[PDB]
Design an enzyme around this catalytic site. Structure first.
Site, PDB file in Angstrom:
ATOM      1  N   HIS A   1       0.854  -1.227   0.000  1.00  0.00           N
ATOM      2  CA  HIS A   1       0.000   0.000   0.000  1.00  0.00           C
ATOM      3  C   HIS A   1       0.872   1.253   0.000  1.00  0.00           C
ATOM      4  O   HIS A   1       0.677   2.126   0.834  1.00  0.00           O
ATOM      5  CB  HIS A   1      -0.981   0.000   1.152  1.00  0.00           C
ATOM      6  CG  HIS A   1      -2.052  -1.034   1.018  1.00  0.00           C
ATOM      7  ND1 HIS A   1      -1.980  -2.259   1.659  1.00  0.00           N
ATOM      8  CD2 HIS A   1      -3.226  -1.017   0.343  1.00  0.00           C
ATOM      9  CE1 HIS A   1      -3.071  -2.953   1.382  1.00  0.00           C
ATOM     10  NE2 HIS A   1      -3.851  -2.211   0.566  1.00  0.00           N
TER      11      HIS A   1
ATOM     12  N   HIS B   1      -6.027   7.153  -3.348  1.00  0.00           N
ATOM     13  CA  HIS B   1      -7.059   6.286  -2.717  1.00  0.00           C
ATOM     14  C   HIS B   1      -6.509   5.578  -1.475  1.00  0.00           C
ATOM     15  O   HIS B   1      -7.317   5.144  -0.632  1.00  0.00           O
ATOM     16  CB  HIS B   1      -7.679   5.299  -3.700  1.00  0.00           C
ATOM     17  CG  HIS B   1      -6.841   4.089  -3.900  1.00  0.00           C
ATOM     18  ND1 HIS B   1      -5.733   4.100  -4.687  1.00  0.00           N
ATOM     19  CD2 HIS B   1      -6.932   2.854  -3.401  1.00  0.00           C
ATOM     20  CE1 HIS B   1      -5.184   2.900  -4.679  1.00  0.00           C
ATOM     21  NE2 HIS B   1      -5.883   2.122  -3.894  1.00  0.00           N
TER      22      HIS B   1
HETATM   23 MG   LIG Z   1      -7.338   0.898   0.361  1.00  0.00          MG
HETATM   24 ZN   LIG Z   2      -5.568   0.285  -2.918  1.00  0.00          ZN
END
Ligand SMILES: [Mg+2]
Ligand SMILES: [Zn+2]
Ligand SMILES: Cc1oc(-c2ccc(F)cc2)nc1CCOc1cc2ccccc2cn1
Length: 313
Positions: free
Chosen positions: A68, A106
């Site tokens: 991430h 995001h």
């Molecule tokens: Mg996410």
């Molecule tokens: Zn993502």
């Protein structure tokens, strides 16, 4: 204004394909994103000075976690670029602007832990936002950065166009919460089948953008096998760290997050492809026929995971 971004020939051609990998050169990812905004949106969509400053602040607010991270942000924006470019006429000027920015933002300030782990740890963010905890934080960081001096990439929009685009980004980012995905796709399934799906209905557009957001977010499963396979390591490295943190709170984690249960990964990827990925790209292909390559690539990787189980790799 006459200052295009261009890319080496191999990238100029491959960036248009759904299975494009943005590569290992971090310093090219900003230019890749701007190239995508310029062709997707226009050379005039954003003040370059402001867009560049916005990108770098976004980059700075992604952390050095295995998956991430800043690379995931740009990868998810490239999948959105591919969808937009193969569905030229279906989306408004404001959606083309909003959605690439939404994708880039995001997962802003992700720590590599799921909503569940924040709730069991009793993290301050879980008191501030009781559902879609990280996603409300991601949108929160997006608005933060838009409000830094010199970073308002939307400052040419009207009061109410500004509110429409920030509302597109909010819904797009909330939709990346995979817990909301299941029901959203079931509704799109029934609407498409009973013939009631209507893209002049704003609530229907919202649902479809949600599904695109899930499709872009999961796009690791739509790359060539060696990309999919090496990304699955980054994904599991975060899951196993979360599993370890669960054990430290005195909670046996689910097997997906338990590093002593690595042997179950191949069978776990099958479950994920059949329960989540294949359905996602199927319904997306039904609504936007040109996104079929994502379904085809996803099915090819399902078959590669079957082969790993049958010990043929
Ligand atoms: Mg996410
Ligand atoms: Zn993502
Ligand atoms: C999170 C998760 O949820 C499930 C799952 C969810 C519902 C279900 F009915 C069966 C399995 N398995 C996993 C483990 C694997 O989860 C993932 C998430 C991914 C995200 C992007 C690209 C590739 C991915 C591969 N595996």
């Amino acid at each position: 204004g006459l200052m295009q971004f261009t890319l080496p020939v191999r990238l100029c051609k491959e960036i248009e394909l759904f299975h494009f990998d943005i590569g290992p050169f971090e310093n090219m990812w900003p230019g890749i994103f701007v190239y995508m905004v310029h062709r997707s949106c226009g050379t005039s969509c954003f003040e370059l000075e402001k867009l560049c400053r916005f990108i770098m602040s976004v980059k700075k607010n992604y952390r050095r976690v295995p998956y991430h991270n800043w690379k995931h942000a740009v990868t998810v924006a490239h999948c959105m670029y591919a969808i937009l470019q193969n569905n030229h006429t279906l989306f408004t000027d404001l959606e083309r602007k909003g959605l690439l920015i939404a994708c880039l933002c995001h997962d802003l300030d992700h720590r590599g832990f799921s909503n569940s782990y924040l709730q069991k740890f009793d993290h301050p963010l879980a008191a501030l936002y009781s559902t879609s905890t990280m996603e409300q934080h991601h949108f929160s960081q997006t608005v933060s950065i838009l409000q830094l001096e010199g970073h308002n990439i939307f400052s040419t929009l009207s009061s109410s166009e500004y509110e429409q685009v920030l509302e597109i980004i909010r819904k797009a980012i909330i939709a990346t919460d995979l817990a909301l995905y299941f029901g959203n796709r079931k509704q799109l399934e029934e609407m498409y089948q009973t013939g009631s799906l209507n893209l002049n209905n704003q609530s229907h557009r919202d649902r479809v953008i949600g599904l695109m957001m899930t499709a872009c977010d999961l796009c690791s499963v739509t790359k060539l096998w060696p990309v999919t396979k090496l990304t699955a390591n980054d994904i599991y490295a975060e899951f196993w760290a979360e599993g370890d943190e669960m054990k430290k709170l005195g909670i046996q984690p689910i097997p997906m997050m338990d590093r002593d249960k690595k042997d179950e990964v191949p069978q776990g990827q099958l479950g994920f492809y059949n329960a989540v990925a294949i359905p996602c790209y199927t319904t997306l292909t039904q609504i936007l026929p040109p996104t079929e390559p994502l379904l085809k690539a996803c099915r090819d990787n399902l078959s590669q995971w079957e082969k790993v189980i049958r010990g043929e790799e």
